[PDB]
Write a protein that binds this ligand. Sequence first.
Ligand code: NA
Length: 482
Amino acid sequence: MSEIRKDTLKAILLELECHFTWNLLKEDIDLFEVEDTIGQQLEFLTTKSRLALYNLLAYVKHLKGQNKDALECLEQAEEIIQQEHSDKEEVRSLVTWGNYAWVYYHMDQLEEAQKYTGKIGNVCKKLSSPSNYKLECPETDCEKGWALLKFGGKYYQKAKAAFEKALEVEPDNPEFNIGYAITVYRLDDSDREGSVKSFSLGPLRKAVTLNPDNSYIKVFLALKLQDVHAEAEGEKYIEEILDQISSQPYVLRYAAKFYRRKNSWNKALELLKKALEVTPTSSFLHHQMGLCYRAQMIQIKKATHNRPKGKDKLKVDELISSAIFHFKAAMERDSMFAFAYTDLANMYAEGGQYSNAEDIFRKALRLENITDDHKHQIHYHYGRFQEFHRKSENTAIHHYLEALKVKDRSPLRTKLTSALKKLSTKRLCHNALDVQSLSALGFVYKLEGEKRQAAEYYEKAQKIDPENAEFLTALCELRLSI
Ligand code: NA
């Protein structure tokens, strides 16, 4: 090209609406997992927009440094536009064209990139857009919503807003309602301060009514009914779904979750195995298998008062071995799957494989780009491992504190404060000058709103370690609290 035809192009590129401008960061996902599962959905979730899936795959290919392959994906997108969006060819091409411009930009084919921005600017003008190189569009809001969801729990609020934007235009659009309801469904399980949420129940009912032939949306409704103690109603939906479809991994896997949660583990395993025939590498399926084996194992341990003998013991050890295999497989398929790490590590611990559990816990504690909620739970589980398996009370205290610092309102809050109190009190009976324990009690009382008692503990800790910066800050906060 030339400089400043370039410098102008870069400005335009930033004005586009497409994946490159939606702040989808590669560090937040396992690129191989995301790439692989997009392909699986193209094959096995046939109700999801192929156009959106190929646009997204193209972006992911670019993120792997495979710009040449990104182009082939966008060509597939263009074919789908003719196949399924012929009547709206131009407006449906904007995201694809945007991705094209950015990919050609990254390949240093600036002239080619400018061709695409030109086509975009053209269509926007034709359609009376208030912006030069983008166009407000419910369809695009929906695509963005799904792209956001795919980048993980950090994006769920942004995804909800994106679907809301689409529903503002078409409140009764079948596709828009599915996206919204699923987003709200996931948020019901995200960042819980407490008990089960069911804000998705209404949206799910609507989405289901608007999509009467869609077994994928229906399975979430069944799960939500289970959550709200309408298990019998939800189970009838499951039965009806399983009559209408077969072998669909994105439906079976959720039916299997439903059955597991009412302790029908053999049925769950049956469904999961059927799904695995179709998609053997799915981290979701492997995690679910692990959960099933874990539950069966726990039932036996409980029945035999944690002292299984003979064949019960042989069975427990097989289940531990099988749970490990599947948790490990899930973790190896998806490096960002926090619960796969913690579930694997906990099972290693259960089996007395402490070196293996420590290795996994270490990796889990170094995951930077997961949600604070997940970091919170990792600290909690490492803490318990330290407390009950390593018998290392000060390491446990450290991680219980880290858990509360990352997230201080969650369903683990009282387990965390009560364990800290117990441990710190015990240690202070042995050594009244134990600074960590004094500091821990200061932290917990501060958290509980007992300002005066907290200040007393921090003052005792500061008396011993006068230059401590954490203790000075805590005391200032306590003095200045309104
Ligand atoms: Na996934």
